[PDB]
Design an enzyme around this catalytic site. Structure first.
Site, short mmCIF file in Angstrom:
data_model
loop_
_atom_site.label_atom_id
_atom_site.label_comp_id
_atom_site.label_asym_id
_atom_site.label_seq_id
_atom_site.Cartn_x
_atom_site.Cartn_y
_atom_site.Cartn_z
CB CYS B 106 -0.94 0.05 1.21
SG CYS B 106 -1.96 1.52 1.20
NE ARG B 109 2.31 0.71 3.73
CZ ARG B 109 3.49 0.15 3.94
NH1 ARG B 109 3.81 -0.26 5.17
NH2 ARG B 109 4.36 -0.03 2.94
CD1 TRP B 278 -7.08 9.10 -2.24
CD2 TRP B 278 -8.22 9.24 -0.32
NE1 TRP B 278 -6.24 9.65 -1.30
CE2 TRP B 278 -6.91 9.75 -0.11
CE3 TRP B 278 -9.11 9.22 0.76
CZ2 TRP B 278 -6.48 10.23 1.12
CZ3 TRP B 278 -8.69 9.70 1.98
CH2 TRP B 278 -7.38 10.20 2.15
CD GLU B 283 -5.17 2.11 -7.15
OE1 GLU B 283 -5.62 0.95 -6.98
OE2 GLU B 283 -5.28 3.03 -6.31
C1 HEM Z 1 -6.65 6.46 1.52
C2 HEM Z 1 -5.96 6.33 0.37
C3 HEM Z 1 -5.32 5.00 -0.13
C4 HEM Z 1 -4.58 4.94 -1.22
C5 HEM Z 1 -4.25 6.14 -2.13
C6 HEM Z 1 -4.14 3.58 -1.43
C7 HEM Z 1 -3.34 3.16 -2.47
C8 HEM Z 1 -3.03 1.85 -2.80
C9 HEM Z 1 -2.46 1.35 -4.06
C10 HEM Z 1 -2.10 2.20 -5.30
C11 HEM Z 1 -2.30 0.03 -3.94
C12 HEM Z 1 -1.79 -0.96 -4.99
C13 HEM Z 1 -3.08 -1.44 -5.65
C14 HEM Z 1 -2.98 -2.22 -6.94
O1 HEM Z 1 -1.99 -2.04 -7.69
O2 HEM Z 1 -3.91 -3.00 -7.26
C15 HEM Z 1 -2.77 -0.36 -2.63
C16 HEM Z 1 -2.79 -1.63 -2.13
C17 HEM Z 1 -3.27 -1.96 -0.87
N1 HEM Z 1 -3.79 -1.08 0.05
FE1 HEM Z 1 -3.91 0.92 0.02
N2 HEM Z 1 -4.64 2.82 -0.38
C18 HEM Z 1 -5.39 3.66 0.43
C19 HEM Z 1 -6.09 3.26 1.56
C20 HEM Z 1 -6.00 2.00 2.12
C21 HEM Z 1 -6.72 1.50 3.30
C22 HEM Z 1 -7.73 2.37 4.06
C23 HEM Z 1 -6.34 0.23 3.51
C24 HEM Z 1 -6.76 -0.77 4.62
C25 HEM Z 1 -7.29 -0.38 5.79
C26 HEM Z 1 -5.36 -0.11 2.49
C27 HEM Z 1 -4.71 -1.32 2.34
C28 HEM Z 1 -4.15 -1.82 1.18
C29 HEM Z 1 -3.82 -3.20 0.94
C30 HEM Z 1 -4.03 -4.39 1.92
C31 HEM Z 1 -3.30 -3.28 -0.28
C32 HEM Z 1 -2.79 -4.55 -0.98
C33 HEM Z 1 -3.88 -5.04 -1.92
C34 HEM Z 1 -3.43 -6.34 -2.51
O3 HEM Z 1 -2.32 -6.79 -2.14
O4 HEM Z 1 -4.16 -6.93 -3.34
N3 HEM Z 1 -5.18 0.99 1.68
N4 HEM Z 1 -3.19 0.77 -1.98
C1 LIG Z 2 -7.13 0.18 -0.45
C2 LIG Z 2 -6.90 0.45 -1.90
C3 LIG Z 2 -6.95 1.76 -2.36
C4 LIG Z 2 -6.73 1.96 -3.71
N1 LIG Z 2 -6.76 3.23 -4.20
N2 LIG Z 2 -6.49 0.91 -4.54
C5 LIG Z 2 -6.44 -0.37 -4.11
C6 LIG Z 2 -6.20 -1.45 -4.99
C7 LIG Z 2 -6.14 -2.77 -4.51
C8 LIG Z 2 -5.91 -4.01 -5.32
C9 LIG Z 2 -4.74 -4.75 -5.24
C10 LIG Z 2 -4.59 -5.91 -6.00
C11 LIG Z 2 -5.60 -6.38 -6.83
O1 LIG Z 2 -5.42 -7.53 -7.56
C12 LIG Z 2 -5.84 -8.81 -7.06
C13 LIG Z 2 -5.93 -9.85 -8.17
C14 LIG Z 2 -6.67 -11.02 -7.97
C15 LIG Z 2 -6.76 -11.97 -8.98
C16 LIG Z 2 -6.10 -11.74 -10.18
C17 LIG Z 2 -5.37 -10.56 -10.34
N3 LIG Z 2 -5.30 -9.65 -9.35
C18 LIG Z 2 -6.79 -5.65 -6.90
C19 LIG Z 2 -7.94 -6.11 -7.78
N4 LIG Z 2 -9.23 -6.03 -7.07
C20 LIG Z 2 -6.93 -4.48 -6.13
C21 LIG Z 2 -6.33 -2.95 -3.15
C22 LIG Z 2 -6.59 -1.89 -2.29
C23 LIG Z 2 -6.65 -0.60 -2.77
CL LIG Z 3 -9.00 -0.99 -8.80
#
Ligand code: HEM
Ligand SMILES: Cc1cc(N)nc2cc(-c3ccc(OCc4ccccn4)c(CN)c3)ccc12
Ligand SMILES: [Cl-]
Ligand code: HEM
Ligand SMILES: Cc1cc(N)nc2cc(-c3ccc(OCc4ccccn4)c(CN)c3)ccc12
Ligand SMILES: C[C@H](O)[C@H](O)[C@H]1CNc2nc(N)[nH]c(=O)c2N1
Ligand SMILES: C[C@H](O)[C@H](O)[C@H]1CNc2nc(N)[nH]c(=O)c2N1
Ligand SMILES: [Cl-]
Ligand SMILES: [Gd]
Ligand SMILES: [Gd]
Ligand SMILES: [Gd]
Ligand SMILES: [Zn+2]
Lengths: 401, 402
Positions: B106, B109, B278, B283
């Protein structure tokens, strides 16, 4: 056996080759360090058997007459001398294989096309300079760049080492101030500090080609002026932005890396410069736009009348892309070989496919294969990778002071 | 004796002592690094719980105090008597915030302290679960002034099946397979789309049809729920200067709400705990619209831009993707919907790394996910070495319920 998936297509492979990694890497089950640039004697015969065994495997000649034979002279060589000399064909097999194994190199589809110059009889500082000068001329080849490596003698105990002190054969100077700021290239400030501290006339400006500090064993480095007509360079202009040429930008044609240690069959060559051709993002994105390099992004954006007062205009991105356009345009006009990062990454995918059938996998460093602009627009972004260390190899080595 | 970590842009050097507390093990060995892969008993429950309570009493500056020893004893007793335990509401809020803070992929953070936690642990059915989710969406969207929130449903526990949200996000566009073999709408969502129809949903046939919710209550088949359309805020995409861009008819939704991950706090598992923040513009503009396996619009955009698409060296792909990202930023700003660009986001993540180094002696971070997917080296995170490791509380991937 690690499962590797391509997310663009959904295909699956298994890297069976990873089961042979030698000099282990920096990652543990508890923390990954793959984003670090630098990760943290009777056994010369161990990794010497290894290479000879590899060599005869390739040429349809494992286990019979000739393979049995070459195994003996090396043990007898090391039993007698404590080290050994490579057959010329082995030195060429090892040069190319080490290229094949370089995890951070996206250009490995070319690995089978390599010109190996055998400087293992080198004798003095003036000597290498001729060997290196033959290299530059041959590699440059009037802009039709040809991959080459010049291998100097293998290190032996008790006496010194051949070593090129420059990181590359062609590097631009970097000149400080009362205010520490650099006219020129900040990646080459220390070596510039040494080159001046050895007689050289520090020039005026930004694209002064550095001289060479070449080190014959035990003796101090000798400076060596590079002949201007040997150093092929490209002035940078833009196909449509007429003022880009007025920025006065230049880069050189030959990327010639001269600080890495080639290791084949347990032998170590601290001076073995290899050279190929540039990928354009190297020059345009990293050399010209890194904040600790030429750092020109804002100046180009000003000239494009971009709105630099808010990040959301993506002005950095638009200027970065036109810089890369100008690099490619200019090199192609000057008739110097260059490959854009889309063409390069697409070829690397073809190389990955070739290595899957050939060796059951390919060591690849994802963070270095994905280009520094437009990463997800290239296929390697969506390709999972396994990074490990195979031998023979190019290794990093300390600076010789 | 801890990993040394250099920032190559500035010359900074720090050592990641926090990595030494890595509570679980990732995929790499000294044989080979797998960092690029997307997917890598009361005694252990008590020892996870102990670590978490220790963490909580550290945060409230009460380590080793009377109340702290009280809690360790209480939790030990409840695991003995029932095999599990219940978090206090204040522990739950800490735990959720911490799982965010610990998430190495993320980039957002810097915001980890500003998280609204909705305690739905008393939720009793799919139908109640749906009301909770609707309130989440409404609160987090806030009419385009987005607020970070998480809603946490009952924990896994012996004897009862799990609450599950089958959708990967609360708001997703349908993906209709076809013959000629191609996909209309979002190809990432073909599987969930097929399950919705098979559970009775009447499909649409557009490219931007919002999916229904498939909500599973313990020991129950999933149940389909339509989102009230006025709860799902969308942004139609226009470009500030290329006016034919509006004619593509592209849209994206305001709220990114991940709904298929597992929240782990002190050994307890919450398999249904959707969280939302947000968007970062890349993305949508780069991944969702330009990935060849997603909407794959890059070439159609570059042709309309009159670019030279027959050779790669013109950088037609780079130019078209930059303008798509501009359209995304412009369109959300126009619609008054929170969005951050990859330059602002990676800058704030750098401040997060400094805050965390001083707070905790390090920060777990996945470089390949933190570095944006366009303009990588133009952002400061590209030049920052990073250590990836797993801390708890955490958000964890879990298998699809079907
Ligand atoms: C508030 C603004 C936030 C922004 C701008 C943001 C941004 C991002 C981005 C760009 C990614 C990579 C996503 C991707 O490539 O698919 C990500 C992943 C992630 N974010 Fe954040 N996030 C935010 C809030 C949060 C919150 C509130 C949580 C949890 C309480 C969180 C937890 C995570 C997690 C667990 C991932 C990993 C998702 C995965 O591995 O599939 N984020 N975030
Ligand atoms: C909290 C937050 C804020 C933000 N702005 N963007 C966020 C994007 C993701 C996020 C990450 C990895 C992902 O991929 C999984 C996947 C499964 C199976 C195959 C391929 N990929 C996806 C697809 N749902 C979304 C998670 C959290 C976000
Ligand atoms: Cl998305
Ligand atoms: C022929 C075309 C070639 C291209 C386009 C190419 C491209 C590249 C690029 C872009 C990098 C990343 C380095 C950086 O970003 O600074 C790299 C690294 C590397 N390449 Fe190549 N290369 C080519 C040929 C070769 C040859 C001939 C060799 C050796 C015989 C080689 C071995 C290596 C090694 C060892 C590295 C690692 C550099 C380091 O870790 O510092 N490549 N290459
Ligand atoms: C064979 C070939 C072809 C091509 N087109 N490009 C190539 C680029 C490099 C290359 C890689 C990393 C580098 O940096 C290491 C470093 C040193 C000190 C501090 C930080 N980083 C440098 C800087 N000399 C060059 C190597 C070989 C190439
Ligand atoms: C910290 C990070 O590993 C560092 O910036 C790396 C990232 N990827 C790279 N990739 C290439 N090809 N060359 C580089 O110098 C770097 N630098
Ligand atoms: C194979 C590769 O790991 C994969 O495509 C990753 C790379 N980095 C990423 N980074 C982010 N933020 N999101 C992603 O989905 C991915 N995908
Ligand atoms: Cl270079
Ligand atoms: Gd002007
Ligand atoms: Gd226009
Ligand atoms: Gd059309
Ligand atoms: Zn690793």
């Amino acid at each position: 056996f690690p499962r590797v998936k391509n997310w663009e297509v959904g295909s699956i492979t298994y890297d069976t080759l990873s089961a042979q990694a030698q000099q282990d890497g920096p990652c543990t089950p508890r923390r990954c360090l793959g984003s670090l640039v630098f990760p943290r004697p009777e056994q010369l015969l161990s990794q010497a058997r290894d290479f000879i065994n590899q060599y005869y495997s390739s040429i349809k000649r494992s286990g019979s007459q000739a393979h049995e034979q070459r195994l003996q002279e090396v043990e007898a060589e090391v039993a007698a001398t404590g080290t050994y000399q490579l057959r010329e064909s082995e030195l060429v097999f090892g040069a190319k294989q080490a290229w094949r194994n370089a995890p951070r190199c996206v250009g490995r589809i070319q690995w089978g096309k390599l010109q190996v110059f055998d400087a293992r009889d080198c004798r003095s500082a003036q000597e290498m300079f001729t060997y290196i000068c033959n290299h530059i001329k041959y590699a440059t080849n009037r802009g039709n760049l040809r991959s080459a490596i010049t291998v100097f003698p293998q290190r032996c105990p008790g006496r010194g080492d051949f070593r090129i002190w420059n990181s590359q054969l062609v590097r631009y100077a970097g000149y400080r101030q009362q205010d520490g700021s650099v006219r020129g290239d900040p990646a080459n400030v220390e070596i510039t500090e040494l080159c001046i501290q050895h007689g050289w006339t520090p020039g005026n400006g930004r694209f002064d080609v550095l001289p060479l500090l070449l080190q014959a064993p035990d003796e101090p480095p000798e400076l060596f002026l590079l002949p201007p007509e040997l150093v092929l360079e490209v002035p940078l202009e833009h196909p449509t932005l007429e003022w880009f040429a007025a920025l006065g930008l230049r880069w050189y044609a030959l990327p010639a890396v001269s600080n890495m240690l080639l290791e084949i069959g347990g032998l170590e060559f601290p001076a073995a410069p290899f050279s190929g051709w540039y990928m354009s993002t190297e020059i345009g994105t990293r050399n010209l736009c890194d904040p600790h390099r030429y750092n020109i992004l804002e100046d180009v954006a000003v000239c494009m009348d971009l709105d630099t007062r808010t990040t959301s205009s993506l002005w950095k991105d638009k200027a970065a892309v036109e810089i890369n356009v100008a690099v490619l345009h200019s090199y192609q006009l000057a008739k110097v070989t260059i490959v854009d990062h889309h063409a390069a990454t697409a070829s690397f995918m073809k190389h990955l496919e070739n290595e899957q059938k050939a060796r059951g996998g390919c060591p690849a460093d994802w963070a270095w294969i994905v280009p520094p602009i437009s990463g997800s627009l290239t296929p390697v972004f969506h390709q999972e990778m396994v990074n490990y260390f195979l031998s023979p190899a190019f290794r990093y080595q300390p600076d010789p002071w």
